[PDB]
Amino acid sequence: CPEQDKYRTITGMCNNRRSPTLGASNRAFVRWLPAEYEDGFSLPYGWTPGVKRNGFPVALARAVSNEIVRFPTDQLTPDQERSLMFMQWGQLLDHDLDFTPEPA
Amino acid sequence: CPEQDKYRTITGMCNNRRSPTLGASNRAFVRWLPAEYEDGFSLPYGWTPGVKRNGFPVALARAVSNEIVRFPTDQLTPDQERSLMFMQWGQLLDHDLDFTPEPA
Amino acid sequence: VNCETSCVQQPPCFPLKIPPNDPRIKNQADCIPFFRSCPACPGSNITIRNQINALTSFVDASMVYGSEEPLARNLRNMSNQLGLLAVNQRFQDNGRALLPFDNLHDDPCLLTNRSARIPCFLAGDTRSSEMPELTSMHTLLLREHNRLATELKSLNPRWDGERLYQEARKIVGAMVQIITYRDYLPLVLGPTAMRKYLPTYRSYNDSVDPRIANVFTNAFRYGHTLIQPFMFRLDNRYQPMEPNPRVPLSRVFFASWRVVLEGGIDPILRGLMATPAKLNRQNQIAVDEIRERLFEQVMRIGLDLPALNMQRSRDHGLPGYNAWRRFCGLPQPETVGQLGTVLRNLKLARKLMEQYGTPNNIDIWMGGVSEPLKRKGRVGPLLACIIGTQFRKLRDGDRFWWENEGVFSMQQRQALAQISLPRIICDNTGITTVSKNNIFMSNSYPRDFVNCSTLPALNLASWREA
């Protein structure tokens, strides 16, 4: 990291002098809590048939969505205090913050 | 992890059921602070000639030892309120807590 | 293998299983496509699997400039010393720049309208084409950069391309930070959480970890509950832009052809300004446009966004609801009665318990969006904690934070304090009537609207090099 600089790097590298990769691209996320996997280190809950999570069966993500998230579209409530731009800025901002890559 | 157990596993696995490997053998240490390497992710400070740390030259570990740690043995002060067992239990306990492997 | 074309659960896939009697996917043996997120340490038997963030965590407008060098260089116009960002060489929006086209292998945008043949756009972030409204925001900022570089060039004739690009980029990064922290975050968290998590900025702290927390990638998806089932387009007098003023969202995903062949970014931006966002309510969480028909035009079947958010949290090994409540210092409900008290909805509490069995297993996104919204905020206590905690770290741990001593001069800081999204829109579009501040609250024409001419332009005098 240069002794001094006037602009941010493209990667985020060197923003933090003592730990120059912090906030930089293509680095692992920081964890605020320890990970919780089926095998303790890699497999996600719902991977192995019959493997419960803390005493209870893993709820199918599609099931939770069907039973709790789904609602009649004609019931939609327009937010009298938020524009759709409020939604749009959130996504645009999200795209400034994180992108979790996957294999193609 | 078994729904119910009676004793500690040998590896330490399953002590924490939500995160099975926590405290278990052959796992990476937890970091209480972000790592500080010469390149930000791997090389130790002092690896590359001329590369300073936080604006200052890295002091040779042997030099610090010679200048600050080294003392005439006749000046040794026997601790009047601690037995040599105090030291020994410390090393024994250390050996219950951690061992950082290296290549042969 | 292809996680998009088969339901075999083998690396790198983790397809979503279908419940018996699903109202849409009748064949229970099938699935919803899902690729596991790339592991930070591939094939390890020592490390606890973690995921990767391909972008800079800082609020630096990297979605415009790029987070990798080759890309950042490719997004720039290197044909001169004007410090500009490359623009589309084939199409223009009523005389205004459009983002250039990307060169993808299996370009999804081409699939949204096979005959139009319009590929996906090239931006700092790979998702610029996901929905036309997003594309319009990406295009808006690209134009603003070029506008800034142009003005800076007149101000400072001796400045070369690199200087002009860097100085314009610097201003854009600051605009995103100001709009985000001054106008956006307060409306997300509410005043109480804003004060608690984002107290007055004092100084850059090099001990504040600025990295995005894994949980945030999922928690910040609270925004999916804000999505309306249509893309609204309005004409210059904010009236429906015929013949299609309300396009179903399931037909705008990756629809870059709409920006190019259906009137540019102006009708889209007006739509965003004068249309209300969907309100998140405990019995109206997310729409079927994203729950049943997500990416319908580019996938074998429609995806389910809420379900994908929950499968993703598991893929990422994220702890359950109570663990996050605990982390946040919030009470952890253990029974349906306690959960009913926390959510101020026993009915929803019961539903969650029938599905998960224990509040300890509720997925972060689900439990997070289930919580009653904070006053003048759009998230409950848990999401407010996670989101608020993250943005303070992104502010305090940023050496280039706009208010940090040495980044901008006092007078530049004073000039920057006058910026606003409504003005930015005025400067880079044919739109002459925009929302009154706060733009994220204003949503009714003509009541919440004013003439662009009443809004002063950003004063760049303090950027003149003496």
Added chain:
Amino acid sequence: VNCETSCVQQPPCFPLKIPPNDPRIKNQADCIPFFRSCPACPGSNITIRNQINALTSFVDASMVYGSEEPLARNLRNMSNQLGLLAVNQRFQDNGRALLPFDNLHDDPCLLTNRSARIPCFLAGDTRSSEMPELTSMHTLLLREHNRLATELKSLNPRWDGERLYQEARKIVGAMVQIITYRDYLPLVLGPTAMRKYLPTYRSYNDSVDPRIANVFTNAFRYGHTLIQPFMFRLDNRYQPMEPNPRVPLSRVFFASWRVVLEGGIDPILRGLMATPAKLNRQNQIAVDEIRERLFEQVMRIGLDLPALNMQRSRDHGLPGYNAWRRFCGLPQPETVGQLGTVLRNLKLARKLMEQYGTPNNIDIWMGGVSEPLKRKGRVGPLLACIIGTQFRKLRDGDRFWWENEGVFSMQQRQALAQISLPRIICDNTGITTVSKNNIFMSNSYPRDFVNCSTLPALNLASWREA
């Protein structure tokens, strides 16, 4: 590159260079051998390099039983149903058990005396032979397990080998926990830090991460400052045991032959009890037996333990002194005057500044052991914070902590509260006079000594299944 025979800096070697005018190594082309700790994710350009802990972090006596299944199995006597740990089949200590020998490719113990041909011992941890005083502690605990398994077999006739092994292993683990937190830790931290970092145990908290922090592996090395330059051996009447009662430490490292052929563990244990530890003073930090002659007999050159500690912290990418002070909520001195104040020693502050340039760069071990010791404690504020924080986590985050409800019965806990290191020594050796509790404080014979007959043994009655 062979890190043991070469001074070339190439992976995985990071040899310590030799400064000009070195008091011992006049040839600057030489070096002190150093192998970088194994990375958790080898060859990654994504992960920030981290190291590995090969042991169980929990205070569960894994140094006795092993942290891996194959080893744990091999340390056990599988020739019967007595639940015993395997003992040496070739040698005995006045009719008592010795640890079995290990089978190492390049046995260092053999090098400490070519003609004795005594290899290193096999224990739960690979370092049992590093120094004869440590081997004596490992041997003591092995005997106690077998003694416990024997008494348990008498009380519960139906218990098989496995049950007996597990029950004795469970008792020993609790013994290590009791001696450590009740007797040891208070004398390390002092009263104030003890109350601050280790408040009264409540119960098992599954939200408390029990892993060893990378920094602790270096910080707990404060114990190197307590090391005396000799191994003291005393006879049954606590008098110097001839003809070699004070062996220079540089001739006891990996000297397993001394345990086998020089009188067993009794003379060693008596020496540990009746000899004072070395006090850590700011200009009497660590002895030359470890600073100049570490492992002199088992390798090409004598190592420097304090220097290794500093090289290791760099290898592990550990932050400097000030970063750790900050982490601990302690003031961070920036000038030599401020550092002089923190250390209550201007002369030491100056030596540090001369070496490091800034307190930000002081290596954790060096800074830690430099701080003045807390009242009735043997570490300063920084180390007290790091060490105290670690041990509370190992306590509160251990499902099998001896006080956790369900682990032991109320009467079993009442019994265990009567255990002590002196008693264990009385139960497993030919020593009849031992230190009064606290064994870690008592160090003067006969003033601090009592007969074994006055110390009630552990009553295993409440272990009766009946």
